[PDB]
């Protein structure tokens, strides 16, 4: 037994800018959560060959102490957690698997994403078998709706409902932002269908932890995409190679941030 939810993020950007946007934003975000000995450590970032499928592979470590609640922290005597994240990014499809050495296969967060040029209208894009599909909650994340942000997390500068791109004129995103999007030609949009699979088989904490992760993943996909957008002007002119170099700089910066910096980031639920 295992808990499955698909997050549907509609965005006012093209499947092709998104490829770059995301990649940039993963790094910015990584940096905003690293410090105090917590956050992101990159170990591997390189192209791969499965033979027929080509794309980029990463192996990261997420370091967690205080940014998670007491009851998670307490799963380990050292009061501290490393979770390993191996990802195969074959944009427009990505498969991400988070595991924990100390736990065999009783623990798993897996994210499977398909980026598609529509408005989230596709049921079961991931072609799951029908019984399993029956148990999937589909959740829409609206990057405009401020009710969807945790108060602690809100920032007017990370708010799409308040941002206008100077480089492209997109924004800011009013309550109808969607309906409007449908009304005009020179308006791209995609949906990220992120299927998240959570497994945590541990006596008496399974439902509790499973649900906590889904709520934390959802918080992330919400701030992240808010930020992706409010960050348009920073990545909208960027090349893949402009990105791979960022990635390199960022591997070292994170290694320096996590050591020399205060705790920053999201603070946990």
Swiss-Prot record:
The modification N6-acetyllysine is found at residue 215. It catalyses: a 1,2-diacyl-sn-glycero-3-phosphocholine(in) = a 1,2-diacyl-sn-glycero-3-phosphocholine(out); a 1,2-diacyl-sn-glycero-3-phospho-(1D-myo-inositol)(in) = a 1,2-diacyl-sn-glycero-3-phospho-(1D-myo-inositol)(out). Residues 250-269 are annotated as: Disordered. Phosphatidylinositol transfer activity is inhibited by N-ethylmaleimide. Gene3D superfamilies: 3.30.530.20. GO terms for cellular component: cytoplasm; cytosol; extracellular exosome; nucleus. It is found in: Cytoplasm; Nucleus. Keywords: Acetylation, Cytoplasm, Lipid transport, Lipid-binding, Nucleus, Transport. Its main location: cytoplasm. Residues 250-263 have a biased composition (Basic and acidic residues). Changing residue 187 to A: No effect on phosphatidylinositol transfer activity. Changing residue 85 to Q: Reduced phosphatidylinositol and phosphatidylcholine transfer activity. GO terms for molecular function: lipid binding; phosphatidylcholine binding; phosphatidylcholine transfer activity; phosphatidylcholine transporter activity; phosphatidylglycerol binding; phosphatidylinositol binding; phosphatidylinositol transfer activity. GO terms for biological process: axonogenesis; lipid metabolic process; phospholipid transport; visual perception. InterPro entries: PI_transfer, PI_transfer_N, START-like_dom_sf. A 1,2-diacyl-sn-glycero-3-phospho-(1D-myo-inositol) binds at residues 58, 60, 85, 89, 96, 194. PANTHER family: PHOSPHATIDYLINOSITOL TRANSFER PROTEIN (PTHR10658), PHOSPHATIDYLINOSITOL TRANSFER PROTEIN ALPHA ISOFORM (PTHR10658:SF28). Belongs to the PtdIns transfer protein family. PI transfer class I subfamily. Catalyzes the transfer of phosphatidylinositol (PI) and phosphatidylcholine (PC) between membranes. Shows a preference for PI and PC containing shorter saturated or monosaturated acyl chains at the sn-1 and sn-2 positions. Preference order for PC is C16:1 > C16:0 > C18:1 > C18:0 > C20:4 and for PI is C16:1 > C16:0 > C18:1 > C18:0 > C20:4 > C20:3. This is Phosphatidylinositol transfer protein alpha isoform. It comes from Homo sapiens (Human).
């Amino acid at each position: 037994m295992v808990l499955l939810k698909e997050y549907r993020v509609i965005l006012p950007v093209s499947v092709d800018e998104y490829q770059v946007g995301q990649l940039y934003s993963v790094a910015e975000a990584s940096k905003n959560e690293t410090g105090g000995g917590e956050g992101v450590e990159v170990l591997v970032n390189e192209p791969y060959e499965k033979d027929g499928e080509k794309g980029q592979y990463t192996h990261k470590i997420y370091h967690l102490q205080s940014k998670v609640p007491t009851f998670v922290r307490m799963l380990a005597p050292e009061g501290a957690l490393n979770i390993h994240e191996k990802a195969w990014n074959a944009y427009p499809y990505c498969r991400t698997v988070i595991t924990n050495e100390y736990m065999k296969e009783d623990f798993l967060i897996k994210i499977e994403t398909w980026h598609k040029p529509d408005l989230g209208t596709q049921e079961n894009v991931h072609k799951l078998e029908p019984e399993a599909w029956k148990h999937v909650e589909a959740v829409y994340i609206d990057i405009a709706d401020r009710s969807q942000v945790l108060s602690k997390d809100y920032k007017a500068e990370e708010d799409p409902a308040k941002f206008k791109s100077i480089k492209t004129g997109r924004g800011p995103l009013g309550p109808n932002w969607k309906q409007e999007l449908v009304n005009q030609k020179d308006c791209p949009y995609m949906c990220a269908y992120k299927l998240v699979t959570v497994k945590f088989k541990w006596w008496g904490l399974q439902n509790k932890v499973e649900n906590f992760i889904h709520k934390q993943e959802r918080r992330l996909f919400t701030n992240f995409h808010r930020q992706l957008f409010c960050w348009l002007d920073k990545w909208v002119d960027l090349t893949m190679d402009d990105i791979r170099r960022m990635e390199e700089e960022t591997k070292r910066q994170l290694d320096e941030m996590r050591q020399k910096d205060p705790v920053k980031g999201m603070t946990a639920d």
